[PDB]
Structure formats: structure tokens, C-alpha cells
């Protein structure tokens, strides 16, 4: 074969894909119909993507992985517009015909400082990584047909000869053109059913400024430096400020807004529906009195999907093509990243001893499908407790405790793998969690909360319970599980900004 990988799209998940097998030793070729500089969202970073980028560095010896997963290394190594700083995810909840009130907020915050991705930024240098390890990349090409064969790969090129590989990785950030022509992909059994408009825009206004000062909020962290997320019935919209880091030279804030199909369609053109979103919530429109939008809005009139396999003997769809959720909590880039680091080794075993079954990459399906299942069972039962406040305030404990469980969970990893240089203990200690896709990864007593609060929200929904009712069940259910989940405090409901 001319080459041993193939790789559809040379975004950030592309990228890193790319730079891991070409570091390896094996011939790596990068596809993509687009081409860079481009523009992408998918831009709050987690505990969780911090830790599976310094995996990822630390597993396959790529130093320069490791600066994606801090600001400071961003501003320094990628430059200073490729980030915003985030200290925490906010909440601020709000409700049509009533005024807004500063005390309706949540606001975790982080210990170490994560990134606000400024994309077309990020993704850039993640190819420049894959390029300076020897994977070729082609860009601003047409895949004219996909073959898969006993022995291997045909990609077929417009005005240009077919090429050959081992084995297929779809890593595009849109459409699953992999997915497409293998007929995996449907919108069947999912919970989650949104719209989402986004752009990016000059001049807003932070939380502070616009709406209420720290002296008000009482909150530990700056809602500006922070991924702010107004939420409400129907849906939610987010302010994630790339401007916000002392050191930056960015001037843009992200702004995307979702509605739950269900309860609300958009039915005119996306600037006709922020200004009718900013009148029923005053509130958010403080931000945007003198805001002016830097680019087109993007319409997606439905973003959710998932995938029924996502690996065959010659192929793999990293997450991204397989299944979508929503944005909310940006569980998108954690589950590619690990998936990474899950296929990656087993495409090594696989070139290395050229065995190409679906049996050996069973697992990395295992994964995947069962994030995207939990993704959405996350999202949906979120979606309800936009609701109200109170409610919000409950469930949003639900999620908070999973995630520090599972962002424990991959730093123990991390320093393990650090103090024994043991990269196959790693694989395996990966592979041996008992919830693999899901937000504790490895804690029985926490995933029997999660499932058990999404079976509290789903009836909710389907019986009109009230919200009240709601919340006080998922409230004694928090202190049923508390004494197994980490020791923060999150059955105290009145404290609204749960510290580490
Ligand atoms: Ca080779």
C-alpha cells in the first residue's frame, strides 16, 4: 500500500490523529475537502480534554501536544489570539416575563485555568504537528468514492490518481462522509432533538459590566473569564469570550444559541431570531447593546445524530463523525480525545502485525457508542431542568460530581503512566474501567446516581411532574450517593459556586 493510514479531515481531531501514527512510524496521509485557515466551533476545553491532551502528549512522546491543554502554553507556543482563558463553567438561568436575577447562577470553578479554543488558530498548529512528524496532508480536495476491500483502502480523487492505504479514520468534524456511504448514521432513539445558531462577534460586553459586578454575584471566578451559559425553557446560549486573557490579543467572543425542537422551531432567518430572543430575555441583550457580528451566522437545523457501528476491518470514525450531541458541556472533545488514545496503539498492533479485523478496535466502538448514549441522556435530562432555577441548581450537582470523578480518574492515569513509563499498563488500565463512555468512568455508586436522576427527568418530562417535586427527588438521591462521591459539599444546595 502507498500508505499505511488514511485521514479524512485535518481539523484538530485529524491532526493529532495524524501526528501519534506518523511519530510511530507509519506512512500517514491527511484528507480534507476544506482548507486552512478555516473557521470551527467546539471551544470550551474541560479538566477532562486537558488531561486527555497531556495523555496523549505523554503516551506517544509529542511535547508540543501537551501546550494545547494550557493558555499560557497556547498563547506562548501557538500564539497570542489562538485562546481566551476559562476558570470555570457558569450558569445563569432565566425565565420569560420576569426580570433576571443576579442570585440564579451556578458557577463551579476550576483549580488550573483551561482554554477557550480559538480554532482556526488551534487546528492550524495541530497540523503543523502531524506535517513536522512526516504525515502528508492534502487540502482543498474531492473524495470522488471510499472503496473498502479484503486488502485494504481505495480513496478515488478528482484530476488526481486514487491513493491506497491499510486502514480508514474518518476524523471530520461534519457530515460523517464515512458514515454517509456505509448507511451507520440515524437519528433513532435519540433523547437530545436542538437547533443551533452561531457565530462570532466584537464588542460584547462581559457578564460583569453588562449585567451584575462581582460584588453582586458573590462568585469566586469572573463570569468573563468563564464559559457562560444562559439557560432557560426552550433552550441556551453561550458566551465564550476569547478576549478575556491578559496576554491575549484576540478580540472575539463565541455567541451560539440552541432550542429544544420540542418545546420551540426557529422559523426566520438567524439575525430575526437573536433579536427576538434577546426580547424575551432582556437579560441576555445587555451583552450585545454595542456587539457587531464578525462573520455569518451558521444555521443547523438539527445537530444531534448517532451511529450503529463506527469500526470495520479497514475503517474507524473517530467520535465526531460517529454520533453529536449538543454542545452543552462540551463532551465532544473528551470523547474524540480518548477515543484517540484508545484506537491509536491498536492501529500500531494492527500495522505492525498486518491484522486488519473489526474484533481488535471492538473496544473503540464499545466507547464511543456508549458516550455518545450517555451524552445524550446528559443533555436531554439537562434540557428539562432548564426549567427552573432550583431545578437547575440540583441537577446541575449530578453532572459536577461525575465529571470531578472522571477528571480524577484521568489524572491518576496520567501520573501513573508518568512515574512508570509504562505505555501498554496504560492501554489496559484504559480499557479495564467498568463504564467506559460514561462521566465517572470507573464509579458504580456514581453511575447508579446518573442513571437514576435521568430516570427522575425523563418522567418528569413525559408526566409534567412538578418542578419542585422534581428537584427535591434528585435532591435526596444527591445524599443517598453523596458519601461515594468526592468529599465537595454537593448535596448543600444554598452553596451555588462548589469549590474544589
Ligand atoms: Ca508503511
Same mark, same amino acid.
Given at each position: 500500500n502507498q500508505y499505511d493510514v488514511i485521514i479524512i479531515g485535518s481539523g484538530i481531531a485529524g491532526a493529532l490523529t495524524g501526528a501519534v501514527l506518523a511519530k510511530s512510524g507509519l506512512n500517514v496521509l491527511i484528507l480534507d475537502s476544506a482548507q486552512h485557515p478555516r473557521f470551527s466551533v467546539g471551544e470550551a476545553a474541560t479538566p477532562e480534554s486537558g488531561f486527555l491532551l497531556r495523555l496523549l502528549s505523554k503516551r506517544f512522546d509529542? +511535547? #508540543?501536544? $501537551?501546550?494545547?491543554?494550557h493558555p499560557d502554553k497556547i498563547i506562548q507556543?501557538?500564539?497570542?489570539?489562538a485562546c481566551g482563558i476559562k476558570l470555570g463553567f457558569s450558569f445563569a438561568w432565566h425565565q420569560e416575563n420576569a426580570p433576571s436575577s443576579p442570585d440564579h447562577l451556578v458557577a463551579p470553578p476550576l483549580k488550573v485555568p483551561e482554554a477557550h479554543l480559538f480554532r482556526q488558530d488551534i487546528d492550524y498548529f495541530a497540523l503543523m504537528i502531524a506535517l513536522k512528524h512526516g504525515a502528508e496532508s492534502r487540502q482543498n480536495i474531492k473524495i470522488e468514492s471510499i472503496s473498502l476491500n479484503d486488502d485494504g483502502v481505495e480513496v478515488a480523487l478528482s484530476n488526481a490518481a486514487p491513493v491506497k492505504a491499510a486502514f480508514i479514520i @474518518? =476524523? =471530520? $468534524?461534519?457530515?460523517?462522509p464515512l458514515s454517509r456511504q456505509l448507511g451507520l448514521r440515524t437519528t433513532e432513539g435519540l433523547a437530545t432533538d436542538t437547533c443551533s445558531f452561531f457565530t462570532h462577534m466584537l464588542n460584547v460586553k462581559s457578564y460583569e459590566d453588562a449585567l451584575a459586578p462581582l460584588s453582586r454575584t458573590?462568585? +469566586?471566578? #469572573?463570569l468573563f473569564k468563564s464559559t457562560l451559559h444562559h439557560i432557560f425553557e426552550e433552550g441556551w446560549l453561550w458566551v465564550i469570550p476569547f478576549?478575556?486573557? +491578559?496576554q491575549g490579543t484576540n478580540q472575539l467572543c463565541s455567541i451560539g444559541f440552541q432550542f429544544n425542537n420540542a418545546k420551540y422551531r426557529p422559523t426566520e432567518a438567524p439575525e430575526i431570531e437573536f433579536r427576538k430572543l434577546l426580547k424575551k430575555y432582556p437579560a441576555i441583550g445587555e451583552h450585545f447593546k454595542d456587539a457587531v457580528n464578525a462573520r455569518e451566522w451558521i444555521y443547523a437545523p438539527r445537530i444531534n445524530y448517532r451511529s450503529v457501528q463506527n469500526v470495520g476491518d479497514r475503517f474507524c470514525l473517530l467520535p465526531q463523525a460517529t454520533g453529536f450531541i449538543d454542545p &452543552?458541556?462540551?463532551?465532544g472533545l473528551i470523547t474524540t480525545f480518548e477515543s484517540i488514545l484508545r484506537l491509536a496503539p491498536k492501529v500500531l498492533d494492527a500495522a505492525r502485525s498486518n491484522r486488519w479485523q473489526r474484533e481488535q478496535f471492538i473496544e473503540v466502538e464499545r466507547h464511543c457508542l456508549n458516550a455518545v448514549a450517555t451524552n445524550d441522556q446528559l443533555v436531554s435530562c439537562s434540557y428539562e431542568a432548564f426549567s427552573d432555577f432550583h431545578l437547575w441548581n440540583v441537577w446541575h450537582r449530578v453532572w459536577l460530581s461525575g465529571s470531578n470523578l472522571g477528571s480524577a480518574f484521568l489524572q491518576k492515569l496520567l501520573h501513573d503512566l508518568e512515574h512508570s513509563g509504562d505505555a501498554r499498563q496504560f492501554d489496559a488500565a484504559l480499557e479495564a474501567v467498568?463504564?467506559?463512555?460514561?462521566?465517572? &468512568? @470507573? *464509579?458504580p455508586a456514581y453511575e447508579s446516581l446518573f442513571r437514576q436522576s435521568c430516570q427522575v427527568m425523563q418522567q418528569a418530562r413525559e408526566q409534567a411532574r412538578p418542578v419542585a417535586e422534581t428537584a427535591n427527588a434528585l435532591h435526596e438521591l444527591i445524599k443517598e450517593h453523596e =458519601? #461515594?462521591? &468526592? +468529599?465537595?459539599?454537593?448535596?448543600?444546595? *444554598?452553596?451555588?459556586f462548589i469549590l474544589k
Amino acid at each position: 500500500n502507498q500508505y499505511d493510514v488514511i485521514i479524512i479531515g485535518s481539523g484538530i481531531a485529524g491532526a493529532l490523529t495524524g501526528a501519534v501514527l506518523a511519530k510511530s512510524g507509519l506512512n500517514v496521509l491527511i484528507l480534507d475537502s476544506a482548507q486552512h485557515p478555516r473557521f470551527s466551533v467546539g471551544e470550551a476545553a474541560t479538566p477532562e480534554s486537558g488531561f486527555l491532551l497531556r495523555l496523549l502528549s505523554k503516551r506517544f512522546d509529542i +511535547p #508540543e501536544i $501537551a501546550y494545547l491543554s494550557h493558555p499560557d502554553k497556547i498563547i506562548q507556543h501557538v500564539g497570542s489570539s489562538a485562546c481566551g482563558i476559562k476558570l470555570g463553567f457558569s450558569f445563569a438561568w432565566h425565565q420569560e416575563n420576569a426580570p433576571s436575577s443576579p442570585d440564579h447562577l451556578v458557577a463551579p470553578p476550576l483549580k488550573v485555568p483551561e482554554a477557550h479554543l480559538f480554532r482556526q488558530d488551534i487546528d492550524y498548529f495541530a497540523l503543523m504537528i502531524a506535517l513536522k512528524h512526516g504525515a502528508e496532508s492534502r487540502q482543498n480536495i474531492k473524495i470522488e468514492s471510499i472503496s473498502l476491500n479484503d486488502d485494504g483502502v481505495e480513496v478515488a480523487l478528482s484530476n488526481a490518481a486514487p491513493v491506497k492505504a491499510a486502514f480508514i479514520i @474518518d =476524523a =471530520a $468534524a461534519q457530515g460523517s462522509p464515512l458514515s454517509r456511504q456505509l448507511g451507520l448514521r440515524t437519528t433513532e432513539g435519540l433523547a437530545t432533538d436542538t437547533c443551533s445558531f452561531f457565530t462570532h462577534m466584537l464588542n460584547v460586553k462581559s457578564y460583569e459590566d453588562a449585567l451584575a459586578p462581582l460584588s453582586r454575584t458573590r462568585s +469566586p471566578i #469572573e463570569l468573563f473569564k468563564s464559559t457562560l451559559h444562559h439557560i432557560f425553557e426552550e433552550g441556551w446560549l453561550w458566551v465564550i469570550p476569547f478576549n478575556n486573557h +491578559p496576554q491575549g490579543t484576540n478580540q472575539l467572543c463565541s455567541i451560539g444559541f440552541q432550542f429544544n425542537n420540542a418545546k420551540y422551531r426557529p422559523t426566520e432567518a438567524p439575525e430575526i431570531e437573536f433579536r427576538k430572543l434577546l426580547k424575551k430575555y432582556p437579560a441576555i441583550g445587555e451583552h450585545f447593546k454595542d456587539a457587531v457580528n464578525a462573520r455569518e451566522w451558521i444555521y443547523a437545523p438539527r445537530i444531534n445524530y448517532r451511529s450503529v457501528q463506527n469500526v470495520g476491518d479497514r475503517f474507524c470514525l473517530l467520535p465526531q463523525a460517529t454520533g453529536f450531541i449538543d454542545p &452543552l458541556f462540551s463532551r465532544g472533545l473528551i470523547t474524540t480525545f480518548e477515543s484517540i488514545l484508545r484506537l491509536a496503539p491498536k492501529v500500531l498492533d494492527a500495522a505492525r502485525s498486518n491484522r486488519w479485523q473489526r474484533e481488535q478496535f471492538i473496544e473503540v466502538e464499545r466507547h464511543c457508542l456508549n458516550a455518545v448514549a450517555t451524552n445524550d441522556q446528559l443533555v436531554s435530562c439537562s434540557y428539562e431542568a432548564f426549567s427552573d432555577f432550583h431545578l437547575w441548581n440540583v441537577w446541575h450537582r449530578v453532572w459536577l460530581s461525575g465529571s470531578n470523578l472522571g477528571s480524577a480518574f484521568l489524572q491518576k492515569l496520567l501520573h501513573d503512566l508518568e512515574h512508570s513509563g509504562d505505555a501498554r499498563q496504560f492501554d489496559a488500565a484504559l480499557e479495564a474501567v467498568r463504564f467506559p463512555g460514561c462521566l465517572s &468512568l @470507573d *464509579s458504580p455508586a456514581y453511575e447508579s446516581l446518573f442513571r437514576q436522576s435521568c430516570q427522575v427527568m425523563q418522567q418528569a418530562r413525559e408526566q409534567a411532574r412538578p418542578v419542585a417535586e422534581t428537584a427535591n427527588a434528585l435532591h435526596e438521591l444527591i445524599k443517598e450517593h453523596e =458519601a #461515594e462521591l &468526592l +468529599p465537595l459539599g454537593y448535596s448543600r444546595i *444554598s452553596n451555588r459556586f462548589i469549590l474544589k
